[PDB]
């Protein structure tokens, strides 16, 4: 794929000295960067990865599919309550296939409505057609024949066919109901468009196109005989069986009877209308020759064969062949060949191409194909997952996850991590490592985002990761919130300095109830003690107790000592003396500055104060 880096300013022209182009992939898929190391080339070109989906519709799609994946539970795996586990397994899986189909339809819709580019709509519909066909052929009957469940099958088939292409588009209905050079509606066109409708199961419309021109007119008048045919034929059409393969057995009976009766009877109509009515009855009766004759595309043939001839997939091999002999595969669209492949047994080798259309769809497709047991891990062996060692599906899912991580949409990160966590293969420790490396890139902003991260660190036991994340968060109010060892020590020192200099946080340490609950370390305790001391000071024996507490704190710990000395001087028995002594025993620029600020020599003043205290003790 060739895309223009910038369809505005292209930084090169002639081969004029092939310039050194440089490119760096960014942490965000949609924000990479290119530049050039050359003279007069100082522009920066932000480039986003070719064919990247940033849309909301896409993330919605992704979430929906992850939901289907998650909801599949144990059934997303395939075990190579006895004979029912099999049937019920297929039941739920087959249903999941329908869910995927739906989610993709919705997505495709929202793409057609909110869009700049409709190419995405077309590709997504194609993906849908191919998936409808896949379900119709492997996700309904579970290897059995149509009799096993005539209702569901014909429903999906009829659905698949009438969503693949648009024709017959009502823009073509009026196209012939307008064209003349003939009497009323009786040229190869009307009938071709009537048969087409029948072959596609579009019986309602079929009937309508008849009650449009000569149901009662030309027939009820000209030939009363063929009028009865053309009428109770429309009656049989009105009651084509779609639930009982018995009712169909009898239906084709009445139809073949009608075709024989009319077959040899009163010809009171034009030479052409005669046959034109016979063919219609043959097609309805299931004549192979005719079903092929009035078919525009192979899938019309195939569909017809299943609807009017013999409703057995045991003949699909033959049906497809005849169909392809009549109309070759139309290489205009990308869905026809894949459908042919599906029908003809070779399901595989579609994952790479679907991966080219859309990574996501391909991923989950491979996943459900593994669930069905249509593809499995043949490998049989290096302590990790993202390889060929596990499934092809595991591989594609894990790949999608990783791809989601660079998308920068925090909504999908749960999908990514969940995808990895639920991966049916790989050691819990291997996953542990992968998550340990991905999580740090989570684009958290809210509090909740962070709590989610943490919850995942808990759930997976990544204390070194959580410790790192938090470290990133820590990097006055912020510091208060934070309150590694060195940092705590520094915080302690700061608190002590503040106390020496001397609200809600301080009280909590010593809405409010919630905070107390959250709080429920050494630095913190020290600050609390300092606060208590200050409170006592604000409030003789109390003062002494506070002074004692201060001396004890000083012993546990230069600036602090100076502040203490200052406090003692301001205040200016045996225990007190002992404390003073210990302080003297314990006894740079910042300290001197603090001393100068307090005064607005220190050792001498301290000694003098000590002497005074001793004298006081002696007098007592």
């Amino acid at each position, epitope marked *: 794929i060739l895309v223009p880096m910038t369809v505005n300013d292209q930084p090169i022209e002639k081969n004029g000295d092939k310039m050194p182009l440089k490119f760096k992939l960014g942490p965000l898929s949609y924000q990479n960067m290119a530049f050039i190391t050359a003279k007069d080339k100082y522009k920066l070109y932000p480039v986003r990865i070719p064919r990247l989906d940033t849309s909301k519709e896409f993330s919605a799609y992704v979430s929906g599919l992850f939901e289907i994946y998650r909801d599949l539970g144990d059934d997303r795996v395939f075990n190579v309550v006895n004979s029912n586990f099999a049937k019920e397994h297929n039941a739920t899986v087959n249903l999941a296939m329908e869910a995927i189909l739906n989610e993709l339809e919705v997505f495709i819709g929202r793409v057609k409505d909110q869009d700049g580019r409709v190419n995405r709509f077309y590709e997504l519909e194609e993906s849908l057609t191919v998936l409808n066909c896949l379900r119709t052929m492997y996700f309904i009957l579970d290897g059995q024949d149509v009799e096993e469940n005539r209702s569901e099958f014909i429903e999906s088939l009829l659905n698949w066919i009438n969503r693949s292409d648009g024709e017959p588009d009502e823009e073509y209905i009026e196209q012939v109901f307008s064209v003349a050079g003939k009497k009323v509606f009786e040229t190869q066109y009307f009938w071709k468009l009537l048969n087409q409708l029948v072959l596609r199961g579009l019986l309602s419309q079929a009937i309508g196109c008849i009650e449009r021109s000569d149901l009662l007119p030309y027939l009820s008048d000209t030939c009363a005989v063929s009028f009865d045919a053309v009428s109770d034929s429309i009656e049989l059409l009105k009651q084509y069986p779609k639930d009982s393969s018995s009712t169909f057995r009898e239906w084709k009976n009445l139809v073949l009877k009608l075709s024989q009766a009319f077959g040899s009877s009163a010809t009171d109509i034009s030479g052409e209308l005669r046959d034109y009515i016979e063919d219609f009855l043959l097609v309805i009766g299931g004549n192979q020759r005719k079903i092929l004759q009035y078919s525009r595309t192979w899938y019309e043939s195939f569909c017809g064969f299943l609807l009017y001839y013999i409703p057995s997939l045991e003949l699909s091999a033959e049906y497809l062949q005849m169909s392809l002999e009549a109309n070759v595969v139309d290489i205009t669209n990308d869905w026809e060949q894949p459908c042919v492949d599906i029908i003809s047994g070779k399901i595989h080798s579609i994952l790479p191409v679907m991966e080219s259309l859309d990574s996501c769809t391909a991923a989950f497709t491979a996943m459900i194909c593994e669930a069905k047991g249509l593809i499995e891990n043949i490998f049989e062996g290096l302590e990790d997952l993202f390889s060929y060692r596990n499934g092809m599906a595991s591989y594609m899912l894990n790949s999608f996850a990783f791809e989601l991580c660079s998308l920068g949409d925090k909504e999908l990160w749960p999908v990514a991590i969940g995808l990895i966590a639920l991966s049916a293969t790989g050691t819990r420790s291997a996953k542990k490592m992968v998550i340990a490396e991905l999580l740090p890139h989570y684009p958290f902003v809210t509090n909740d985002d962070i*709590e989610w991260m943490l919850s995942i660190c808990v759930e997976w036991r990544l204390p070194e990761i959580a410790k790192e994340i938090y470290t990133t968060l820590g990097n006055i109010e912020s510091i208060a919130n934070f309150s590694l060892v060195k940092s705590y020590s520094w915080l302690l020192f700061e608190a002590s300095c503040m106390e020496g200099q001397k609200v809600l946080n301080a009280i909590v340490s010593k809405d409010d109830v*919630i905070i107390p*609950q959250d709080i429920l370390v050494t630095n913190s305790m020290r600050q609390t003690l300092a606060p208590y001391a200050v409170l006592s000071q604000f409030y003789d024996r109390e003062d002494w107790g506070q002074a004692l507490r201060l001396l004890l704190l000083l012993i546990e710990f230069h600036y602090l000592v100076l502040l203490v000395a200052k406090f003692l001087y301001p205040i200016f028995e045996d225990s007190v003396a002992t404390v003073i002594e210990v302080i003297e025993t314990k006894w740079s620029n910042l300290y001197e500055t603090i001393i100068e600020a307090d005064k607005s020599a220190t050792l001498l003043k301290n000694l003098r104060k000590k002497l005074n205290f001793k004298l006081c003790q002696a007098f007592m």
Partner: antibody, heavy 114, light 104 residues
Framework: VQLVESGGGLVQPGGSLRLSCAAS????????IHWVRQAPGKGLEWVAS????????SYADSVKGRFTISADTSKNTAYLQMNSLRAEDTAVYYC????????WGQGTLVTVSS | DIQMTQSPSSLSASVGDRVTITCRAS??????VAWYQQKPGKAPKLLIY???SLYSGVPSRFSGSRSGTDFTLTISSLQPEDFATYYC?????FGQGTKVEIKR
């Protein structure tokens, strides 16, 4: 991110109403939910709050004994049960949260009369 | 219960003017004071928390400050879209509100 408020309307005096506030986009479990009301042409009046963390609740004097605030963390939904309602209680009622009050309910009008 | 008194209760100012609204707490609350803007018929919107922290996304023309027990909300350059009632907040209690209009 969005608070949603339902269940007000018209109510006879002495009557009762349960207001819901369905939350999303944030941690209900560590947030506080507050109810603040505004009577026609008047200012804002805080009536009640609940801690989803501790379950602690409290009330303005004007509604105490008649209003009960509660919360179900498992559906991210909080409630205000309003009994013995009075003309004085007619107001638009807002739910709001704290982790100041950053996230506000679009409000629902409670009219109380006979 | 704590009372919060806003001054003035009402004001008129031209576009581009600097506007000051003050709020005085009955007792000494701590910087635990928030400012909100309410358009008529709509939920209040947070402007300022912790007295002086600008809530995320709010235009920088709005600022908060404290001097003791006086809290100040300032709008550095008044815009036509700025007409509203503004409330301070510290039971939780709200100030009585200041109505701001455009003069012509």
């Amino acid at each position: 991110v969005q608070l949603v408020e339902s269940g007000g309307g018209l109510v006879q005096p002495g009557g009762s109403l349960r207001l819901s506030c369905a939350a999303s986009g944030f941690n209900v479990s560590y947030s506080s939910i507050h109810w603040v009301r505004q009577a026609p042409g008047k200012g804002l009046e805080w009536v009640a709050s609940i801690y989803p963390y501790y379950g602690s609740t409290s009330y303005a004097d004007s509604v105490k004994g008649r209003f009960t605030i509660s919360a179900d963390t498992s559906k991210n939904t909080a409630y205000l049960q309003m009994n013995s309602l009075r003309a004085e209680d007619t107001a638009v009622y807002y739910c709001a949260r704290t982790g100041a009050l950053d996230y506000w309910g679009q409000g629902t009008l409670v009219t109380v009369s006979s | 219960d704590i009372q919060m008194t806003q001054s003035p209760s009402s004001l008129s100012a031209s576009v581009g003017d600097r506007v000051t609204i003050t709020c005085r707490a009955s007792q000494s609350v701590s910087s635990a004071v928030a400012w909100y803007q309410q358009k008529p018929g709509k939920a209040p919107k947070l402007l300022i928390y912790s007295a002086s922290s600008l809530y995320s996304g709010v235009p920088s023309r709005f600022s908060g400050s404290r001097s003791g027990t006086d809290f100040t909300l300032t709008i550095s350059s008044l815009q036509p879209e700025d007409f509203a009632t503004y409330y301070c907040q510290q039971p939780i209690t709200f100030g009585q509100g200041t109505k701001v209009e455009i003069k012509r």
